[PDB]
Design a protein around this ligand. Structure first.
Ligand code: A1H39
Ligand code: A1H39
Ligand code: CL
Ligand code: CL
Ligand code: CL
Ligand code: CL
Ligand code: NA
Ligand code: NA
Ligand code: NA
Ligand code: NA
Lengths: 659, 659
């Protein structure tokens, strides 16, 4: 067995299979290779008949493992063997394992692949590596799915209903699949993932040029590999996360950089990636943004209000649209009656054309002067204001609809026929914004802007047009936000609307929310709840009690998103956000989220520490629970140490008012 | 054009295509044939290269349509044509339209199909019939998905976040797909569906011998049919529900019976099927069951308590399992401190072997005498009691695991390798129950029983074994319940745990819960909330405020499902359920749910009337709303007229206590 070793790590590479283990020498923990099949990698390719098959590349006809430098092992997998005994002659995979001379870091790279007369697709490499043994290792997989989750590697006490769904998912297909990088759906928002137990942690950072997918397996024994054969899996329940290199489309460097952290967990992983985020240029702190624009300080302690008038979906929809006088009175009530000191007012429905023509200010809703009177009132309060804007949609029900600004593929067919909100080719979107945004800014004296959709993901197609639009919006130096966001867009915005959680998502029944994105980026980008899942709606992600406490733990601001007719029903939640969340949000806004901890066995009691000197403890479950020192945290309760030495304690209560 | 007609309906059949329209003569409403492509049916079959294609059968080379009787038209679709111009020579579909001589009822049957050298799969017939025009018809599709939903045929005011998800889903693939009959997942619980506008309603009742699937299209314009071609759909947004006949599988009579109801809605549809439900033998009333077993009267006004000790998933799991003394103390507190007058106590974890060996009573938890003391205490309060039982599982972590009791398919492969809870062949399950259930009944003096899993669905395979087990359990004449249930099992049980809603489900963002199953069966089967989604958990289906109010509207009982460590957190919800839901559940338990109404434009205010004389009005949204006569229903509030004429009004409040 070929060995790479420095002071912190030892890489044990098998000469016959190419599998490797990693001994983390400070703790002594050994990361084993594939526990199921001893597979260095899993390669999906066509056979002689043309059918797709997945093969174990350690079963290849020739395997060359040679120590090639002081700290480099080169591997070559030549002529894989199919299930029927036939050979994929002329197919080869070349890889490299490169140990850092000093640090506990191992680069893994697929350097070459040859197809011969076959077609290569997915390669899991390394396969089923860095796994945790279910109910023996007491740790978790760490997955930055949107704001982020952890997936414990062992069964633990929890509500009986949750428990049944949790355990069942680890035995069926809910616990296996793949996610993609940098989308606003089910996918990841940072190019890393990891696993840890009580002794040691490992996380892998994907090369900036590459777009692998991430395979997950959360305590599943691999029964999904045997269902079609109708036999029982012979494998052990394990947790692993694998890169999936898309060999049929990947043009970048197929490299992942593994970092090994004695005693680390998801916090330590996030702080490792934070260094790489700064080196990649994503990290532009809110302090620098405030130096450039003093109005950024209107955001700490601000509640984000979305007044949804049925727009952009419909123009002046009866029963949904607000007039500008109605908008002005909502603003006045929020300040004068509800005593809200700071706010971002976002008015969905101020123009009489459909997006992407964000003009004119609608005559039917009252006209420009009445809109200016509403914005002027908000500004007199120190509130931020923006209309709803989007430059990406092309809507069927728009009388101005045309396919002119839509993109066509190489066969001349329209793209995004299935995504009505993202149909305008990004190379046109700056031009569309230029039609009226400067006129609205100067007429209303705008201090703020929110632009929706265009920056919710970071895909390659159209990226140049999106950067052009981001640079243009940024040149105005407004306090500005965008829907969802991604790390690549952080330099151009002050806040992201979202970057929290989908309601229905893979892993939802077998994961806990963890503030992974904010552990990296809280100093750099402010985030608020998503308008589809606001703090006033009861969803899979919780009611107001749960969402307000999670807001303070994770460091995001409150989102109240409502149709006008709902407004009277919003008042109690606005008041509670005002009294509880707003002061914590304000104090912690610019700070680093230094640490996050789960303090109860059911993961419902949690503790977050911010570099402003603020400590948030909250209990997101119904029963009181004790933490160290015998302190009790009430159900749906909190214990918050503020910078000024005050201790905020309390809890939410649901009461029945029988007349 | 060929005409079938009686005093109520006129059927116009096109001789060129086989499409037909139905005029309801009293209202002038015309139900149209396929508005998109004028297809009588859509047939999926292999071509001469063996690739599956879907064809419009009205494009067949030879279409024959003629009156073969006074009220029968026979149709023959001969030699379908593919899109490339080639003919599926020797394929034929024969159908019949049979008008009832007196009633507004049309039977539609696929009587014959020939495949030649081709293979036939799905047949949508009739294709895209009985549709509603989106934003013109103001009605809904009616779908008995579990407890049931309606899908409105127009856009209407609602919370802005809900609105965005709603409208967006009608444009993408979330609004098209198919469901199956009689499962405990995403599917239907009654063999009917329908559509209605403000003028008239139509529903189709599937023949008892057939198992079609149901295709849905909820306000979608068919863009899903054109995305692969990269063109914009030229069709209009419509609502339709189609039977999918599985020609490759179906052995029953492929008949659907359409009933046309002037001025009807989902309530009238349910009452039409209720007559058929009785004719089919499903309907055995709770009054009959009470006559046979007076202990049935321990259910009205009872809270269903599931004490979840980590079983059947684990045996004596630390941190989850309760001792029998702890169980006894929970029963005492519920009665003495929480003053719960009636209850069903369901203890998950009383045996020291894994299911399906439901024995012996665990010595580690205290042994038989201490369990008997807990059960004796419950009986002294008049409470019902059952342990957790299941005879269907075969679990990987059971030391007694064997594939000997599992079922194999025609190829000899194990079935249900991916469904650990339903692996034992039903033909073995009565014998597994016989091993100890009579000894538990005799030793504990049991009055009740709940058996899980086996009766949650109604599939053809294994049904003889399940019927055998159901008869055996029913022969004990205990007050008995089972997980989820289906209509076919109603004669054998007194209560169903479930028959509510999945949390994640197709159509969830474009439908409203409606009590369709209980509008049929409330007199015949009691139902309670599902243990995965109990009234103490905050989920996609609501918090305690929403679930308690929906409980009273739909006529279901309270479910409190908890791990023992949560108990102290359950107290406020047990109290509010006791004060509000339990007296209404008690009064309405045996009655017919005569009617259900949506009273507000956002469908959140609702009114239910029970044949006990009880009226429930509730507001499941945050804002107060006015109904007829200017009466105001507070957000999360109610207005209940009891049988004795007294009025109850009130509302839930969420408060923030700050020390
Ligand atoms: O997990 C399920 C749950 O416990 C075992 C499974 O079946 C019966 C209950 O629904
Ligand atoms: O529905 C969406 C919603 O309004 C248009 C869509 O994109 C921006 C907002 O998320
Ligand atoms: Cl875009
Ligand atoms: Cl959050
Ligand atoms: Cl079964
Ligand atoms: Cl319900
Ligand atoms: Na999956
Ligand atoms: Na800015
Ligand atoms: Na779908
Ligand atoms: Na019974």
């Amino acid at each position: 067995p070929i060995v790479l070793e420095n002071g912190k790590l030892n890489i044990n590479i098998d000469s016959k299979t190419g599998c490797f283990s990693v001994t983390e020498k400070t703790s002594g923990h050994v990361w084993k290779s594939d526990p199921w099949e001893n597979a260095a990698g899993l390669l999906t390719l066509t056979d002689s008949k043309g059918k797709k098959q997945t093969v174990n590349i350690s079963k290849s006809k020739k395997i060359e493992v040679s120590k090639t430098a002081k700290n480099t092992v080169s591997l070559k997998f030549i002529d894989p063997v199919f299930e029927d005994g036939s050979v994929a002659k002329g197919v080869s995979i070349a890889t490299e394992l490169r140990l850092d001379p000093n640090n506990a870091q191992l680069d893994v790279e697929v350097t070459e692949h040859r197809s011969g007369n076959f077609t290569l697709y997915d390669l899991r490499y390394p396969a089923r590596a860095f796994s945790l043994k279910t109910d023996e290792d007491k740790g978790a997989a760490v997955i930055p799915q949107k704001q982020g989750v952890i997936c414990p590697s062992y069964i633990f006490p929890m509500n009986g209903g949750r428990f049944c769904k949790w355990d069942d998912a680890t035995y069926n297909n809910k616990s296996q699949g793949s996610l993609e990088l940098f989308n606003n759906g089910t996918g990841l928002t940072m190019p890393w993932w990891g696993t840890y137990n009580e002794k040691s942690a490992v996380m892998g950072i994907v090369d900036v040029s590459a777009r692998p997918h991430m395979q997950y397996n959360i305590n599943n024994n691999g029964q999904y590999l045997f269902n079609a054969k109708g036999v029982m899996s012979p494998y052990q329940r394990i947790v692993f996360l694998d890169p999936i290199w898309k060999l049929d489309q990947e043009k970048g460097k197929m490299r992942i950089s593994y970092h090994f952290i004695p005693g680390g967990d998801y916090v330590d992983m996030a702080k490792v990636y934070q260094k790489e985020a700064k080196a990649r240029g994503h990290f532009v702190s809110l302090q620098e943004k405030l130096k450039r624009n003093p109005n950024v300080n209107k955001l700490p302690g601000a509640i984000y209000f979305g007044i949804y008038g049925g727009y952009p979906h419909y123009v002046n929809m009866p029963g949904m649209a607000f007039t500008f006088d109605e908008l002005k009175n909502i603003i006045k009530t929020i300040h004068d009656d509800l005593r809200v000191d700071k706010a971002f007012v976002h008015a969905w429905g101020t123009f009489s054309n459909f997006v992407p023509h964000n003009y004119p200010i609608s005559e039917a809703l009252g006209g420009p002067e009445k809109l200016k009177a509403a914005v002027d009132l908000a500004k007199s309060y120190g509130y931020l204001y923006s209309s709803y804007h989007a430059y990406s949609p092309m809507l069927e029900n728009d009388p101005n609809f045309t396919t002119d600004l839509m993109q066509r593929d190489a066969e001349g067919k329209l793209m995004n026929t299935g995504s009505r909100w993202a149909r305008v080719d990004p190379k046109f979107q700056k031009g569309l914004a230029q039609k009226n945004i400067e006129k609205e800014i100067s007429y209303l004296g705008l201090e703020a802007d929110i632009t929706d959709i265009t920056f919710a993901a970071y895909r390659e197609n159209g990226k140049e047009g999106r950067i052009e639009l981001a640079k243009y919006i940024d040149s105005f130096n407004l306090v500005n936000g965008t829907e969802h966001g991604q790390e690549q867009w952080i330099p151009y915005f002050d806040m992201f609307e979202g970057m929290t959680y989908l309601e229905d998502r893979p892993l939802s029944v077998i994961s806990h929310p963890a503030p992974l994105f904010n552990l990296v980026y809280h100093e750099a980008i402010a985030n608020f709840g998503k308008i589809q899942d606001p703090d006033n709606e009861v969803t899979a992600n919780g009611d107001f009690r749960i969402k307000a406490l999670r807001s303070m733990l994770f460091g995001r601001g409150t989102t109240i998103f409502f149709a006008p007719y709902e407004f009277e029903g919003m008042r109690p939640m606005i008041e509670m956000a005002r009294d509880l969340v707003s002061p914590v949000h304000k104090e912690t806004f610019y700070s680093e989220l230094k640490s996050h901890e789960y303090l109860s066995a059911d993961y419902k009691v949690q503790r977050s520490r911010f570099s402003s000197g603020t400590e948030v403890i909250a209990n997101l479950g119904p029963v009181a629970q004790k933490i160290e020192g015998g302190i009790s945290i009430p159900g749906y309760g909190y214990r918050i140490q503020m910078k000024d030495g005050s201790l905020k304690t309390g809890h939410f209560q649901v009461s029945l008012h029988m007349d």
